[PDB]
Amino acid sequence: FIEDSEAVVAVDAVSFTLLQDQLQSVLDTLSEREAGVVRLRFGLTDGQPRTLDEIGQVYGVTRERIRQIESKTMSKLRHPSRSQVLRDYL
Amino acid sequence: LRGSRLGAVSYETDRNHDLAPRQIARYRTDNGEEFEVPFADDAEIPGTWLCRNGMEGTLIEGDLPEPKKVKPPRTHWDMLLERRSIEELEELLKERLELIRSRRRG
Amino acid sequence: AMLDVNFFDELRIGLATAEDIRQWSYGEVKKPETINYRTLKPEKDGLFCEKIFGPTRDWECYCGKYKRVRFKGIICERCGVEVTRAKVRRERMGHIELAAPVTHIWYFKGVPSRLGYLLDLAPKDLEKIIYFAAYVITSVDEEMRHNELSTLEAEMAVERKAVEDQRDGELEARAQKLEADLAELEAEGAKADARRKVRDGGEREMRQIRDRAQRELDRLEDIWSTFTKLAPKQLIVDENLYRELVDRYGEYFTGAMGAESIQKLIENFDIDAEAESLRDVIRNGKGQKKLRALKRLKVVAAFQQSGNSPMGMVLDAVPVIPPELRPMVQLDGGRFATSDLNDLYRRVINRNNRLKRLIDLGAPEIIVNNEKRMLQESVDALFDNGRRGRPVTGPGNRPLKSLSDLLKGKQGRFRQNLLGKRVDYSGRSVIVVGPQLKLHQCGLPKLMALELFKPFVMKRLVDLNHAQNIKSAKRMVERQRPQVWDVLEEVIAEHPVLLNRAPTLHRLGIQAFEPMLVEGKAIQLHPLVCEAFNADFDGDQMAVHLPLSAEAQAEARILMLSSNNILSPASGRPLAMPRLDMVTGLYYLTTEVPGDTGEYQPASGDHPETGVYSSPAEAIMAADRGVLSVRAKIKVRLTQLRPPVEIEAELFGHSGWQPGDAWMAETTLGRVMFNELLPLGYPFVNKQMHKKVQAAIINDLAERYPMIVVAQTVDKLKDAGFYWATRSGVTVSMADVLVPPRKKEILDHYEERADKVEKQFQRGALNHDERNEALVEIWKEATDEVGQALREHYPDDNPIITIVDSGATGNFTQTRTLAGMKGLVTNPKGEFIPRPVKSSFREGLTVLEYFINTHGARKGLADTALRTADSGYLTRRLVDVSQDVIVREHDCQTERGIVVELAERAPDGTLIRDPYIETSAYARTLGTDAVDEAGNVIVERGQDLGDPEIDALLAAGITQVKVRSVLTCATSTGVCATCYGRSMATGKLVDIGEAVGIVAAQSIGEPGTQLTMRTDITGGLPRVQELFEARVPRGKAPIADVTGRVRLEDGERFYKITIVPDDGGEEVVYDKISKRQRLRVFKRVLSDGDHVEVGQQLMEGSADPHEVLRVQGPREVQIHLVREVQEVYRAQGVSIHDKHIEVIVRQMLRRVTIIDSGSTEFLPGSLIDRAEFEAENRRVVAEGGEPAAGRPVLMGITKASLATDSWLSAASFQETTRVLTDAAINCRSDKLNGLKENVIIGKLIPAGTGINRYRNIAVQPTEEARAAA
DNA sequence: CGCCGTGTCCCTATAGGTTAGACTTTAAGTCAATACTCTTTTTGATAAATTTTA
DNA sequence: TAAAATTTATCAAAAAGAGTATTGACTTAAAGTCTAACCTATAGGATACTTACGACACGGCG
């Protein structure tokens, strides 16, 4: 009679898969620089979260430029067009 | 009632392709059995290891980096020697020596 | 394995060596630590160590260096935990390197002691050797001990001579003291006794002193005799002797104590030589020695053939079960929850650690041996708690739960969750009757179809753009937002839902219905499946399941859909037959009332007939107007109904096709309206729809027409039945329960007789029991007379008697008790109370009479509960026995077969039909042909033999047909198809995948419950049980052995019967036949000089199937068992076709017993399958010919199950410990081919849609349609 | 070979280890001034198709 | 029956932020490290006490 409060919720796992897919599509709407900065900044490609200096190094620019592209991209995604699609997962 | 073994669960695809490359290291046990221990590439490989058998096993690669022996557990001799002096046990030894050899000569 | 598939094809048990153990383990536990007290993380090298047993967190090592998937398969170089998924802790095992050997508790203490046979020692003797209480010599040479002996008897003579130097020193010293007694006694003036009291004291001193010397000399003589007779492989006590023997004879032998010495014993045990000696003994020995060799011979060859080297009994390194199977769950609040395997493992580990410590210190033998004993004790406790001593308990003195108690008894896996499993996608609810659904449809409350199909509706209302994604759909559905329902109808249509009831007594307890969303919260069930489900509406609940895969929904839609499963599996009578209310409606619809409104009278002269009606349409119009009653006799002119056979042959002869033809008929309007329900091809009926008539109609209509027509016709009958049951005016009012005017006179007439009987008892003319019997008979006569007067009093339109004589429900006795007399009421013990009750329930009983009625009814209720409980046991056993009778081949092509009685001859001479033909002859396939008076063939070989052909046979005038049966099917594993005949459920031939064994078991053990007892032959369900158990009958009765006349004699207070042979030489004498019995009556009573049969029954009663087997072969016992069981089932009026009982009986008579071994492999008294026996004889006729002599045996169902080959099912049955241990000893290999072994390991069962003839069919578009596509 | 009974299912002293607590570095983050060129927006500012008027 | 008039086309210019940086500056997050300090594992203590809490099968007997 002991519910294991750690089991796979079934709907949670499939929901996470759907979130992965939808987020991937939305990020693919971003420009190449934008998609790259987002994926690296939030570790969507290897699970390692790269920080601003690493991202500026692998793109060969200054970290201030990386942060500006970051802010611009975030604001673009906050736009309801590509936002309301992902609201429900949260 | 609701309980759960103290722990956690993850929901991520088990990608079998893009991982961190491993590096199998051999660790010979005292009896000599070999037990593979996969290690990552950029990873300081230890000379010794606790193997799958459960006894300490050293690298098949030649390292032999000092046994690092420890002080012996206090012995009965240690617990006796403090309270009593060597010369003091000497007279008792001679008493038993004469006792048993008197039995012998008899 | 580590990686698994569904191709599992052999589960092979076998003892495991420690060499296999330290290669299983992924580490080694060494510390008795469970989880840290403060941080609540597992310990290193403990019982939960992540390095040994794998991470507790998905893709995280202990110290947290690697914490993601990209690092997988690697081991972190500092905390040592291999980073991987966190369910390996379900599967990785450990081991414990013991410091000293230890032995099992299963192959030693469990009766019989397998080790005890193995090493040739008794169990109690070994229980002193492996618990450190007796030494053992492991080997010896003694060649030079021969010469050393001579030296030591010389030294023994020297020692005993020194002893005698001491002894004559005693003699001399006490002699001097005794002459001092002389010199101080005689010299002095002491009393003559006193002066010699010292004399006696000294002589007594020498007596006790020579006792001292003599006793120590016997001690030395004993030790010398022991050394001379020192010999190996024995049990020795007196450790002191052992010490003296060793330290004087330290060479010449080695001897040790405990589990290491026995390890050596097994090391120095040669199974080969011992086995040859055992063969020699069993071949040449006799009596007890031969048998003791046999049982030992069994286990020794078992080890020899397994090649398993019994070392598995001495358990070195001990394996540790994975942590997750023994969880440490933390119930919220901090209260931890162990699993009690943690505690036992901790005990063993603590004791092993302490033993290692003591060994290092070098403690005296007392402490080390005690600790080894405690290790052994705790290992034994862990592998089984409660064996070899009192249970190891804990808090609340509750016994713990050793691994065995997880795999034994009723709470082990092998008698529990491997039987039943909670399932997702399920629900239940209370049921209500829906007289609007079709037979296939069913109701389903919306609030229960939105939480069963929730994934389907989620997907669907995502696809229709009502939700942005899945999460929105889940929340919306959970909030029952307006448009979920509209989608729910779309996801429901054409998707079955199995509707099960509990108890699932028989096969129709689960059926598949197409759901139909209905409001409320009660599952609306179609009323015509109540008979199958045994579901009244007093608050029954049913469980809705949900098939998911394409195969599952196809299964429901095709196999289990209600419309297809109309007929019953047992006797083929319909179970969608309109019952109860509908039957009353149809009766009232089709009954005929003379003198009703608007009859046909041919009276003329003044006016015409005024009875004819041009069409049933005009008849209905005249019925709506108050002219025509529905039940008046009229002459209609029909054009859409087929006339009966005689009228068709009259008006049309051969080919009257109805849709156009016209014909008149004198019937009632009700019967026309009724026959409009039945299909067009069916002839006109024109009867009064008694329930049996409707049973016959639906049986014929199901035997000749497709199934969909049957379903639609049954639905139409249901509708008409309800509609005309409302109009029938069947009510109950106390003005409508008429009492018989002539009751008081009847009661006075029988009261006078009761009074007279009581007077003859009061005057002492008869004893106490006889007057009770007389009163019982008188009041039975009174009950019969009151019932008869009541029956002749009532009219026919009385609703109570209308309900009864319709066959809707209720027998006539209940009417007799409602009005008239209750009659005799039983004792709590079973006898009849002689009062008796004389008031109807309409008149209202008095106090005492109600008390007696309570006696009866309460006992009845308790008995019904227990009877249901027992029916369950019988069904379980029958299913176990007949789990492996599944139809394999289309045709065994055999020619043998039983004969059928089939309308025995009349004395005057006719063909009177045998009443029980529908259970014994129908649905069978002939092996021979029907020929008569050297005429033509009538029915050829292999025909279904339904009703029309039976009518043809009875018309042609034959009485016996030789028909096939599942008793003589010659297929190896299970029956063929043509032997099983028509499947009683389909109406067609049985398929090639059916599990007819399970259908037979269910159909036999289902109609129990309602199986009463009688007023010393057992005559109910226990009788059936003792028949199938093949017990010796409670009322054993003698059976003849050979023909001839009888030697009848009435001896002292009981009988004496003997058979006069006609060539049987020795006369069989039956002496001790009691006076309480009765002689058999047949045709007249058994008279002296009467000619008896070979196996004629002497005493009316019952006989033991073993004896009739031994006398009259297998055929006779099969017929006897079938007849005897069907006698019970006919007595209760339950229709069971004989082929089910024949399946079970065929499962009884498989094996044969070995009376002569021949020279090949077969122990006498052992029971082996017939096919194996014949194959072995076929093999051994070559390579030198010798037959093993076999005799047929009849064994009960339980014993038949006990001899199943598969250890898995065998253990799942009962006695798990014994089954598993013996299977292990013999390295048993199950093939996973039953329908019970394949329901455990989850793969596909070899029956129905699981066998490879159906599971591997290939489906492809046909080339023509594919090209058109 | 049969017949039966009964067995069994209180404290101190060392030492290590732990964390906590906080200072001087990093190393990663965020703000703001200028700056440079450039597709595109955005509002502005003149030309041309559809409707008013005598 | 033709203008005087009311709205679609095109850029001029500013700009406007994008396409894009830089640089410097300030900040903090951490974090590495030094120190502090506080559990926790570990061991050692001296009159004398001395053994607790219904059936199935095998072995004996006849």
Ligand SMILES: [Mg+2]
């Ligand atoms: Mg009920």
Ligand SMILES: [Zn+2]
């Ligand atoms: Zn680690």
Ligand SMILES: [Zn+2]
């Ligand atoms: Zn057959």
